[PDB]
Ligand binder design. Structure first.
Ligand SMILES: CO/N=C(/c1ccc2cc(OC)ccc2c1)[C@@H]1CCCN(C2CCCC2)C1
Length: 297
């Protein structure tokens, strides 16, 4: 009997040595099987597959535990959806722009590129090891896996239209933000002392205005005390002037012909508009901004 040695895994951390009969398909021996995102279930082993690592679906307690510990989800479809996305994201190009990893436009990924750029400029501790590992690989230039995971965790497929604010929110909900806090106080002369506190993910997000200067000053009138490493402000896309040094980064959204497109503006020594692979540098920027991110120092 002709056989080769392969490795199976669900996390690419614990590798399980397996002997495969080249006469049988991977699906008959392991079940649904993947190589770098490609479904090889109906494929028989090639000699080139010797010593390669293959993803399989967790069909036993050992693989289930390893999967849950690594991904922090029980969704049985997660790994399949992750692999399906990876087979595309691995083919995307990831150019370095101004020291930041970006994505060349493909499969309507402007929102992912903009999120990827933003994530590199804020300090975030993910709870799932899968995200934390891919996060640091993405910051180093290898972001194909991180992008595939974002798609999987957000229940979005390659090519699906997406929203940066949504994507950031759902990723924040897989992060440790327990120390973040936003204390709100009612501004009144007759109501006395009225305060409520938002803790966790709610404290790092706000919808309604883009300016932190205004948000801090007011809103009935509410005084705000913000204690978070970062804050994301979102508002309907409208013409908005981005002044250098007054923000960290921002998302621009254009809706020409109801076909959306995102660009990323970051504030470095000057303003940089990163549109996928494209880069435009300006001292001033006016555009239809919809998200602005601010960092604590
Ligand atoms: C015309 O786009 N309007 C948008 C929008 C509308 C109301 C908002 C109200 C807000 O606070 C009250 C805060 C943000 C808001 C944003 C987003 C802009 C970004 C792109 N999205 C698209 C929707 C599907 C794909 C992406 C749509």
């Amino acid at each position: 009997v002709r056989t080769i040695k392969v490795f199976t895994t669900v996390d690419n951390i614990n590798l399980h040595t397996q002997v495969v009969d080249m006469s049988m398909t991977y699906g008959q021996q392991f079940g649904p099987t993947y190589l770098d995102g490609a479904d090889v279930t109906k494929i028989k082993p090639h000699n080139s597959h010797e010593g390669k690592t293959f993803y399989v679906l967790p069909n036993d307690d050992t693989l289930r535990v390893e999967a849950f510990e690594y991904y922090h989800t029980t969704d049985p479809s997660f790994l399949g959806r992750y692999m399906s996305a990876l087979n595309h994201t691995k083919k995307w190009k990831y150019p370095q722009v101004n020291g930041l990893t970006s994505i060349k436009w493909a499969d309507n990924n402007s929102y992912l590129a903009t999120a990827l750029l933003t994530l590199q400029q804020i300090e975030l501790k993910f709870n799932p090891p899968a995200l934390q590992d891919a996060y640091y690989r993405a910051r180093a230039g290898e972001a194909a896996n991180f992008c595939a995971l974002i798609l999987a965790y957000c229940n979005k497929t390659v090519g699906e239209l997406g929203d940066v604010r949504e994507t950031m929110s759902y990723l924040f909900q897989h992060a440790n933000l327990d120390s973040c806090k936003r204390v709100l106080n009612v501004v009144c002369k007759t109501c006395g002392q009225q305060q409520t506190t938002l803790k966790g993910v709610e404290a790092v997000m706000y919808m309604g205005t883009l300016s932190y200067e205004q948000f801090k000053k007011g809103v009935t009138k509410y005084l705000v005390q913000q204690e978070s490493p970062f804050v994301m402000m979102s508002a309907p896309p409208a013409q908005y002037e981005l002044k250098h040094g007054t923000f960290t980064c921002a998302s621009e959204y254009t809706g020409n012909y109801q076909c959306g497109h995102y660009k990323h503006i970051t504030s470095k020594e000057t303003l940089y508009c990163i549109d996928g692979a494209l880069l435009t540098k300006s001292s001033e920027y006016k555009g239809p901004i919809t998200d602005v991110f601010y960092k604590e120092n």
